[PDB]
Each structure stands twice: as structure tokens, then as C-alpha cells.
DNA sequence: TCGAGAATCCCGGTGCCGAGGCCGCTCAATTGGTCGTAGACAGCTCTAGCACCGCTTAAACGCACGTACGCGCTGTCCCCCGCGTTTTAACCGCCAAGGGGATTACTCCCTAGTCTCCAGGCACGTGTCAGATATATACATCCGA
DNA sequence: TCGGATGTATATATCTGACACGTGCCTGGAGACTAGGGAGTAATCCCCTTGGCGGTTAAAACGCGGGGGACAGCGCGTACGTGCGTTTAAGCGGTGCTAGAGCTGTCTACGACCAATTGAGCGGCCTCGGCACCGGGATTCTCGA
């Protein structure tokens, strides 16, 4: 690529001068630790019964998710300093850095034995074996569907199988801008030179924009209920329509891009459409990076963990690998513990919206019609702003809604998100919890007493040892989540170490960082530092009352809620040029 | 690239005042770096002092205030 | 004997909140008391100087925030500043 | 009257807001002390104390000792660049010295 | 061709600059450097001329002291010429690294 | 009443007793300031100023100049051991440096 | 403008007492004013802290004398102390 | 009383080894004793003056701590 | 017999003494020296044991820092043996004798 | 590479003194009003900092050079290290006398505070005289010869 | 060693603008009280400091042997100070513009202040377990073949 470029490529090509392939899409994940497969070439643990992990038999992911994380839903403890917006932004950020592709069921109708229906253990099917006494399915012959992750370099069993990354590693607001040139071409309208992004041409919400509609061979959105006939939304990620809250966030981002492009056209009418679109993309990427590294990270790692793993920015460094670590994919999914069993919708008075203001999460997955035909994104955003998140407790790891009745309307049987996460971890073949503790430098427990001491709970240590037998057999997700929380944080020390290291690598290795010299004008950063999420919600959404600074912390009304006019608007006078 | 404004003859004159007879060729880069670090520290302190007073003009009075704070108090420019 | 005031109970509470099981010794308690007293004295002196320094007779949150920004070096200061703001915000709420 | 509620509970901090306010008022610092200054000062002190305590606890756990001793405190303070800069001219009693040797002195 | 041997007019310059009390750094480049450094912290900043003068005086004093200490280190090292290692050692001993 | 005499006249001091007292009282140094403390402070300040100014005047007379410029003040401060110790970390604007050269650097 | 009080005529009076002929330039006037202010601030701060140590809320001649003894190094201090004593004496008699 | 010899040569050797010194000359001990005497004289003078003001005949650890803090060598662990 | 080469047990002593936190100067001689030094300022002065301990800790810390700086100067001078001129230069640079 | 050897490091019992917790209670923090004033805010002004603009010209830049110097190599010896042995007193554990730190009650004298007024100190406006600026001179001082 | 070359302190005009002085005016320092509490001074309690005893043994002092490195030659490449020719923006001096520093007048809400209340934290008094000490075995770095 030419050495004189000042906008990021769609695929993230040549972001690092030394290696153009660093951080590019459709590339294999980087491995911090060597693989821990079953046969050492390509096999997940538990594939062949009777084989033990370091001398101890492997535990079924469903079996370990039945008695470790599951807790009654009536004893929920809301987090007094965590909003649902916090978990939603965490999920949105996870929807940007990684997306592991899976082979299609239709394309695997011959040799892939349609794993979505049957569960014969043949590639690429990795079904979850079921234990007895299961509260939901009493029949042992049943099976939770699961698809093997797509390999990176197909061939002989000479190299350890890796996973392919289908999204840009860098934080460049790729969740709504796409990651491939064919995806980005149809994601922006070419009817004129305004530079705006695609806007749905069928249904509008109070005169505002929405994600463009998409057509697929087997659309899961149509399977919600046939009286709707609302298709799945199209955005930078395939799973943009997984939940209405996530697609409302994507709608907000798209509206932000459209408003920024319109304002820039008003400021500089002489600019062409492509230049306007590139400028809007760059500003939106800087926005996302600023929000993530100023309002989200301090509310995840904690003051100590962030100060130890995310020091002050010195300058751009091209020697740090910016690729997504294979452990980050299974570590950043800790947000499943911060989810809430119900989705909330509120009015301008911040009161429940009829008919269904508190909807169970079971009847909300893959429901694109709720956004279109039930008031838009205003009540969804209000509920996300004014609903406390669920506190992450050792005996209350995750609610049963995403554990027992997730994706019920789409697939034949409900899935189990924690066991799914553990099965994905075993498929990727990452080392055990003890090995990652060794990697982060933390002490490595070996007995029941040591595990109880490090986890500060003897009962949970006994529960874990009843299944795994040894600390080295603990999967990364369970070990990370079950660890005690930090001070003013929401993750354990190991998860904090992993997340901080990965985000430091992503920030230092980013040649288009908003604070990096040359990428942004030396005077524009002062105006960009004044942006904030509630202000931009005020700008691009009809609501009039929002939260104060650090929106992820305020979760009460009207104790700490302020009007739209108080927040300072973003100043774009420095872009006149 | 403005830090080159501190010309090599200027650094040579400063060293001559300090009492240095012979100067190596690599001294100038280190001197420029040290000067930049010291100016960054003093200017940051002065800018913080000015920002506190809701002022947009950084006076010499705030500069000598910052120098006194840093432990390098200067006379002849106020207090 | 008289009632001498020390920060033993508060530092112990902070330690228990951070490390629920790790204990502390008398010498470490004295060291922490001296350190907190020294930091408080430095910040209060800087704030008093700043208050008198622009011809103002009061010390507000802005003076303490500026003193913290000036004294604490590097990222620490920023974090501290944020923490301070958060605390004040809570008093604004209640 | 209404039930007593300590200012630390309102601020959410663990350090004493009232004691800090009294020290500021009676410390000959200013003629008047604002109502928000002691809360900010207590928050900053609590954050610094928590930082040092967490680092010392990490060092003590690395040394297989349950109780925090001044050696662990010095190891935690001197191993952090920002805290070392803060306590540039502070000597910790029975703190020892960071274990280091110059490269040339080695065989 | 009257050419002074290396090391004579250097001492003459040393004596002349020690006997004088002028400013050895050109005013405009130092002002530009100060403005460039300050604008990284707050844009649209205005500097009084006295502010640039005071900053220049403090910088000159600090640099003169550093150069004197570096010369002392170099003389201790059985050398006449100063080297970047001498500057680094002087800064390390002074307590700035 | 009676004729008003400045408190500096009673103590035989050329420095202002009243101004020093007001500065001490309003500088938030202590809640109450005694009567003799401002006079003691004025005497100490007058003696220190007299010493440094006498040394500066001696230097100026040695330099064949009548007025005292900052160079003379710097020479007076640095050439005296006690005053150098008092002002070790004090930089005088346009003061320069005492003329000295290391013995080894001398040509030979 | 407004009254900006500074030690300007007092330094000139001291010079006239010491040197009956020589004058002093404006830059040296400012340097002398800064030196006087710095010494005054240092001594007052030392006296305030020292009185705070002994739980005495009143600064007297003893506190100033002790601060002068602590701060001024070497023979100077002794001379200063002597001078101060004489001044206080001239108050007591008159 | 020539009690400066109380700090024995092995004591200075141990202090140097703690400081990270591999080889120690034979003429260092006199200089080390002189430096220790000067530092102790300064700190003791400050502490004794502090005690002198308070009309006390006993020099408490608090006075020594305050003297060290004034000297720029603030010492923790004693108050 | 077993005779360690010179410069070997010195490194072992360095490693051992940089790991411990004991007091290297004997308590009684230091207390007697402190009393002798204070004798020149006021007669019949009584010292608290805590004051003597604090003085010992401060003196040890100052001497250790001075020795570290002197070792840095010596290693700068292409030498591994500390000499008194290195101590003098370190003190002069730090700003004590200047 | 390959054995001996000495120091260091890793585990098993011992118990002991310091750390964590509990119990009174007391003095400091809290709540509830009051009132004076310090600071926020609006408006005006007129220093003074910022932005071209032309002409010198001292200073920076670039280059040729060769000589003093940084640095590498080498030889001496002698000073400091390692260690064995003997002598010194540091240290540990009571043991007693008491100087003086620490606490408490009376009070009285000194400093905060207030009203008044008049004089010291400041900002103004200025005229002159130390001082900076040319200029020729006689030393002050360095480099082959 | 002595004549020539460069640099500079020195004596002599010549402007020049910085300051020491004179003056009008303003505000705060001082005289003259009143009032209350800070602490000066007895008076007492008992805490911890000092001096002393005596035994163990860790540590310091002394001396012998040797090795390595501090230091002084000796030399070699080089790089940087010195001077000359070329180029450059620094400084000066004017000119113009307006940003905002600073000042003044209003008004309010915010903190000092006082009284009653009560509970948060501190001193004393426990009780137990984390680790310093003790011992024995495994590990490792050093050093002579
Ligand atoms: C089916 O979806 C439509 C979408 O408009 C909705 O109105 C209707 O209530 C849904 N029916 C059920 C039974 O959920
Ligand atoms: C970049 O980071 C690497 C470690 O990943 C570090 O070694 C290197 O020095 C860094 N480079 C710069 C220019 O800071």
C-alpha cells in the first residue's frame, strides 16, 4: 500500500508497516500460549471418551455448568454501580474485535450431517454431551447443537489447528462499518454524493434512520413469529440482530455516522462523498476508542489493574503484535455474567411502557420486529440507561434465562451459554486455568485448600474440584469468572490481566490511534475529548433526559439524571479546513 | 520539528559558560532531549496553575510559581 | 492516657476490602499512618497555597483537584482525580 | 431528630470525611473550607492507600507471607514507577533495598 | 597563517561567557519551542513576553548547572571531553531518572 | 490623642513592623500572632537584607560601578559561604556564574 | 491601577544606611523584593509548623527565634538571633 | 572520647555490600566516618533545636522525624 | 582447601544483604556516638530509644544511597573498586558540599 | 564435560509473643437553624499579546584540515580480598533509682476585635547623570623561530 | 627567546533613558479601649531512661597468602575545534487589531457558628495462630581436573 495514507482501510491492510498482515481480517488468531489439543494436532478434549486431562477425566461442559453457575433466578442481586448499558457496551465491543466463523449447515448437508438437527460426533459437529438429572432435558439421547470453529490453514495434521478471525483486530468502529470490501460497498448508498450510510427504505422510527434490511437463505429473524415478517438487520457484523439492545446500539451508531456526514457536508460543501465518508468513519472510530478507553475500561479492570496494564500513552509502537489473542475471545465473554434475565423499556417519564415493559430474554433473542414495530430504540435505550446490571457473585455466576432458555424460538431446543462458552474454549484448545495463572504471573493453586485460598471461597473450590479434579483442568472462562472481583471492578485478577494486556497491545499497535500524532490534527483532539455517550444519545435520539458522565455507573432516576441541554455538544469547527 | 531551534552553537555557548572545554558530537541530542523534558515539566505545571485561575494567558508570575513548586525557585520575576 | 488519633481503623478497613484475608503488622500500620499523614499534609498545603495564591479565602473541590493533579505524578493523578470527582458527585446526589 | 449517618456513608468512601474536614479547618490552611474539599481529599487518600495496600499484598503473596511487613511495603513502593516518583525523597524504616547488581560487577 | 592551536580560543570563549551575563539561547527559537510544547496541553494559549523570558532564564540556569556537573563527571573519568554517558550519569545522581 | 509614631521607629528598624504583622496575621500562618514576633521578623529581614546589600555594594565598588546590577548581587551571594548555603537552590535572573576553571583544563 | 504593596523603599533605606553613595537598579530592586519575600515565607512557614507541633496556636517571639535558628545556617543565624533579641528589647523598654 | 571508631570497618563494608559494592578500597572508611559524622551532626542539631524550643530535656523520636522531614529526608515508621 | 576466587563471596554477601532488612551498624556504638555528638549542643541530654532507632535508620538509608551513587561513579570511571574521590564527587554532585 | 565441596534452598515439628477481636464510654461528628459575606455573574475598558512587514546583519551553516585526544593493548606490583585464629564487647535478661514527660486546676494578661483618624506609602510626572555605545591605544597573551 | 599577530582592558567623547526625587491622594496602621481564653505556673503521677550487674557468643581485630586490577606506558585512528566562505532568519522598528485581565456593582447561597444529641473510635483486656527459631535433607553454584 502507498506510504501516504491517512484513512484506515476497510480490511485493515498494512496497518503495521513491518507486516501488512498484522490485524487484517480473514487471518488466524495469534496464540499467547501453545495449543493444548487432545492428540496434539487437531482435536478438542472430550472428543474421545476415556482420555484424561493430565491424569484426570475431562468434565462435560453441561455437567459443570449444571452445578457451578446455575442458581435460582429469584435471588438476583442488582449491581448498585453497574448499568445495563455497561453490559451492552461490553457486548458491542466484543462484537468488534472478534467473530469466529462456522461452516454453514446447508453447505455441510452431505458430510457435515447437519449438526443443527443431529448430533453424531463427526466433523464439523461437536455436540454437548448431556448428564443425568438435567433439569431441562431428562432424555440422555438429546444433544445441544454446536458447530466446530472454522480452521485457519487446512491441510495435513502437521500444524496445530488455529481459528480464523473474520473481523478487524483494531478498534476502528468496524461493528457498523463492515470488515470486507464487498461488505462495505453495499453498506453505503451510492444514490448521491452525500456520503451517508445505508438507511432502511421500508420502516422508519419517528422520521429517523434504521439499519438496512437483509436477505438470507435461512433468515433466523423470520422465525421469531410469522405475523411479523420483519427481516434481520444488516450492519458490520452478522450477529447485529442477535438482541434488540445490540441492534439499537448499532442504530445509534449509524445515526451518529449519518448526522456527522450531514454536518460535515454543511460545514464543507466542496468535499466529495468518499472523502466525507472516510472522515466520518475516522471520527466515529476515534469516538469508539475514546469511549472504550475512558468510560468502559476504568469500569472493568479497576484503578489498580488499569494503571498496571494501561499506562499513559507515549507514542506509537510498531513492535507490538495487535492481533486478537486466542484467549481474549473466551475471556472477554465475561459479560454473560453481567446480563439480566429481563429487558426493560421506559417512557420519557422513565416508567414502564405498555404492553410488555419487562420482557423475558427467552422471547427476545433474534427479535428484529420489536425495534421496528414497538416504539423504536427510545424505550430500549431508556431501559438500558435506567436498569441496574446483575452483580457478578461466586454463587450467582449467571442467570438461568441465558442458561436454560436462550435461542429457544430459533433452534429446536434451547442452548446454554456458559456450557457453550466452555465448549468453545475446549474446541480452541487453550490451556487450563492454572496455566493461564502461571502466564499472568499469579500463583498457581494445586490442591483444594490452595484453590479455596486463592478464590476466597472453600465451598466453590469444593464444587469445582468435584467436577474438574485438578486446578489445571479448569477451563479459562469458569476460572476467570469464579475469581473474586477487584476493587471497584467487575472481573477477577486473571481476567483483568488478560484484558489489560490485550487492550494495551491493541492500543500501542494501533497506527491510527486518536492520540497518535499525525492521525488527528493537534488541535482537534481537544474538541474530541469532550464527547460523551449521553450527549450523543441526546443528539441522535428523541429522548430528553440522560445520565451524567460515566454513563455505565449511573443507574437510578431521577437521582443522577440531567437534561440534554446541560451536556456540551461536540464542536466540529476545527474540521472546516 | 521545532526542537532543532536550539541551535548547536547555542548549546556550545551554554557549555562554554558552564566550563566545558571539549564537547562530543553526540552531546547535542541529549542536551535537546533534557531541555525538552525540563521545559515539558515546567510548562505543564505552569499550564495547570493557569487553568486553575480560569485564565487563558500564562504569565511569568505563574511560571516562577511553578519553578518554586518544582524546587528551583527563581528571583527577579515577582515573588 | 489521652486520646491520640490515628488512621489505623480506616487503613485496616481498606485492606480488608482489598484483601479479605491478608493481615498487617504494627510497623506497617505506623508506616501507612505516616504516609497518609504526609500525603494529606502535602495536598492540603498545596491547596492552601493555591487558595491564598489567587486571593481567595476558601478552599473548594477545584483547589484540591488541582493540587492532586500537580502533586501526584503520571497516570495515578488522573485516576485519583476521577476518583475524587466521583466522590463529590455522590455528595451531589445525596 | 433524624438518624445519624456518617459522611463516609454518604460519600461511599471508607476514610473519615469528618476527621479530614476537621483537620483541614483546624490545620491553619484557609480561613474557610468548602463542603466538597474534605470529601475529595478523603477519596484521594483512600485511593492512594488502596493502591499501596494492594501492591504490598501482591508482594507479600509473592513472598508466601500472610502479614504485610515493611519489607513488602518497600518492595511494592519501589517497584512502581509512579509511586517511586511520588515517594522520591521518603525513607521507609526497615524497608531494605531493591535487589540489583550492576552488569559489569557480575562475573 | 596564524592558526590557534585546538583548545585556546575555546578557553577564551569560556572566560568571555563566564564574565558576561547575557542570554546564550536565541529568544525567538526558544519562544517558538515553548509555545509548541505548551500547545500540547491547552490550545489557544497566550504567553506574556515576561513568561518566555523567565522560562528562558530558568532553562539556561538548569542547563548550565547540568553542563557543569557533566564536566565534573568527565574530569572524574580521566577525560576532558564530555559525553552523553556523563550527562546521563549526572542526571541519575542528581535524582531525575 | 497623641502624635502617631510607626512601630518600626520604636524598635529602631528600617523595615515595616506593621506590614510584617499584617502579612503574618493574614497569611494563615497561625490563629494568633504575638506582639514581638513581627518586630523580631522585621529585625531579621533587615539584618539579612543589610548583609546581602553590603556585599553587593562591595562587589559593585570592586567593579568600578555605582549602581547595583543583578550580576553584583549574584557575585555577592555566591562568593559568601553562608549566603550560598542559604540560597543553594535559588536562581538569580541574569546573574551568571562565578569565573572558575578546573585545574586540569588549564593549558599546559 | 491598584495598590501592589512590595518592599521597595525599605530596601533603599537599608542601602542608604549601609552605603551612603551607591544606588540600585530596578531589576536588583525586584531581586531584593523576591529574596525578602522568600525568606519571610520560609521563616513564617517554619514558625507556623513548629508552633503546630507543640499544639500551641499562638506564634510568639520564641517560635520565630527557633525558626531562624533552624533555617539560617552557620554564624549568620547567631548574628540574626542577637539582632532580633535587641529589637524585642527595644519594645519592652519603650 | 574518640567514639567515631564505634562504626567498625566491617560495618561500613556491610553497608557497602548492601549498597551493591564489589570491591572497597582501604581509604574509604575515614571518608565514610566523616560523612556519617557530618550528617549526624546536622540532624542532631536540628532535632536538639526542636527539643530546645519545647522546653524539654528529652529528645523524642518525633523531633528526629520532624528534623529529617525538614532536611528533605522524610522518614516513615515513627509518626 | 577450598579457596573462593576474589570477588566471589563478595557477590554472595551482596545478594544476602540486599535480601534482608536488618540493621548493619551495631546499636550500642551508634547510640554512644549519637550521645557524644549531642553532647556538644546541650549538656545532660536524654535520648528516647525510638529516637536513636530512627536516627540509625536514617543514617543507614543515607549511607546506602551515597554508596550506590559512589558505585555508579566508580563504574562510570571504568573501575570496580570504590575510592574516596568517587565519594567526594558523588557528594558534590548531589549538592551537599556545593 | 565432570566430580567434591560449601552455601543456599526446601520441608517437618515447637511455641510464643504480637495481631485481631471484644468491651466500656467519652469526646468528637451530626443534625437543625441563623446570618454574614465571599464568590459567581453581568458589564465595561484599555493593556498588551498576537499577526505581517521591510532592512540590516550577527549568527548559523557547510566544508578543509590536522592535531590533540578517546580508546585499545600490555606490563607491574601491591592493595585488597578469603580465610584461620584470638580477643572484644554487643547483646540478652533482670534490677533498682528517679528525672522528667505527661496531665490537671487557677487565673491573668495578652491578643482578637472594634471606632476613629491621620500619616506612610504608592502612582503620577520629571530632569539629569551612571551607563551603554563608538574609537584609538597599549598592553595581555599565544605560536613557530 | 623574540618579533609579529590577535584580543582586550583602558582612557576619551557622546548620547540616552532609568531612576531618585517631589507631590497629591488613598487606605490601613496606630491610638484607645473592651473581652475572653492561651497558656504560665504550681502541683502531682508514674513512665520510661540510665546506670549496673553477669553470662554467651557473635563479631571485630590481626596476620598470612595470593591474585587481579589500578595505574602508568605506548601507540593508533579519528573527530572536532579553528578558520573561511556562504546563507539565513533574529532583531529592530513600526503598524494594526482585538482577547481578555482586570476592575466594579449586584446578588445569593454557602460555610462559620451555636446548641442538643448520640455513636465511632480509642484504650484496655484478652485469646490464638504466623512465623522465628531449630533441625535435617535436597539443590545449586564454584572450582580444580
Ligand atoms: C407477532 O409479531 C407481531 C409483529 O407485529 C406482533 O404484533 C404480534 O403480537 C406477535 N404475536 C405474538 C403471539 O407474539
Ligand atoms: C515496543 O514494544 C516492545 C515490546 O513489545 C519494546 O521492546 C520496544 O522497545 C518498544 N518500542 C518502542 C519504540 O518503544
Author numbering:
A (entry chain L): 167 to 743
B (entry chain F): 24 to 102
C (entry chain H), G (entry chain D): 28 to 121
D (entry chain G): 11 to 117
E (entry chain E): 38 to 134
F (entry chain C): 11 to 118
H (entry chain B): 23 to 101
I (entry chain A): 38 to 135
Paper text:
The rMPO monomer binds only to the histone core complex, with no contacts with DNA or histone tails, in agreement with the ability of MPO to bind to nucleosomes that lack histone tails. The main rMPO-binding site is located along and around a highly contoured cleft between H2A and H2B that is spanned by several acidic residues. In rMPO, residue Arg473 acts as an anchor, reaching deep into the canonical Arg anchor 1 site on the acidic patch and interacting with H2A residues Glu61, Asp90 and Glu92 using hydrogen bonding, and is further stabilized by hydrophobic interactions with Leu65 of H2A and Leu103 of H2B. Arg653 serves as the second anchor, which does not reach as deeply into the acidic patch as Arg473. Nevertheless, its interaction with H2A Glu56 as well as the hydrogen bond between Lys654 and H2B Glu110 help to stabilize the interface. rMPO residues Met688, Arg691 and Gln692 provide another, smaller auxiliary interface by binding to residues Gln76, Asp77 and Thr80 located on the histone H3 α1L1 elbow, which might contribute to the rigidity of the whole assembly. Using this nomenclature, MPO belongs to the variant Arg type 1 subclass. Notably, MPO but not rMPO can disrupt and disassemble nucleosomes effectively.
